[PDB]
Amino acid sequence: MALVLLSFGVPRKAILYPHEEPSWSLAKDIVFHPYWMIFGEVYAYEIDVCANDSTLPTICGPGTWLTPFLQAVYLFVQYIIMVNLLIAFFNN
């Protein structure tokens, strides 16, 4: 579950923030939002940053249409497979 997290946070932070110099904030932002997604926080109005209801309208740019596809795969893996595999683990 920690690897699926980094498989998602690093492409997302890279596609949505292309103009970043090296910073310790890059170690938070690859791990912060993808972790809070495991607990039901979808960040609904940050998905599709080019939408009109977006709360990140300045992040709209080339390639950012990829991130909602990425997060759809991410939560399917984490919530629909990995959290329920862990329920199944505990039950058995």
Ligand X SMILES: CCCCCCCC/C=C/CCCCCCCC(=O)O[C@@H](COC(=O)CCCCCCCCCCCCCCC)COP(=O)([O-])OCC[N+](C)(C)C
Ligand Y SMILES: C[C@@H]1CC[C@@]2(OC1)O[C@H]1C[C@H]3[C@@H]4CC=C5C[C@@H](OCCC(CO)CO)CC[C@]5(C)[C@H]4CC[C@]3(C)[C@H]1[C@@H]2C
The contact mask relative to ligand X for 47-86 (x = CB under 6 A, - = no) is: -x-xx--------xxxx-x--xx--x--------------
Decide which of Ca ion, ligand Y, a second copy, none touches 23; Cβ closer than 5 to 8 Å per partner kind.
ligand Y
Sign of CA dihedral 58, 59, 64, 65: negative
Find the DSSP H helices in the chain: 2-16, 25-29, 32-36, 67-75, 84-91
Q: Which residues in 23-52 contact ligand X (CB under 6 A)? A: 24-25, 27-28, 31-32, 35, 48, 50-51
Contacts of 66 (CB under 8 A, 6+ apart): 11, 15
Q: Which residues in 20-79 contact a second copy (CB under 8 A)? A: 32, 35-44, 47-48, 53, 55, 68, 72, 75, 79
Angstrom distance (rounded) from CA 75 to CA 90: 21
Q: Using CB atoms within 10 A of its CB, is residue 87 exposed (0-12), middle (13-18) or buried (19+)?
A: exposed
Q: Which residues bind ligand Y (CB under 6 A)?
A: 6, 22-24, 26-27
Which residues sit at the interface with a second copy, rule CB under 8 A?
32, 35-44, 47-48, 53, 55, 68, 72, 75, 79-80, 83-88, 90-92
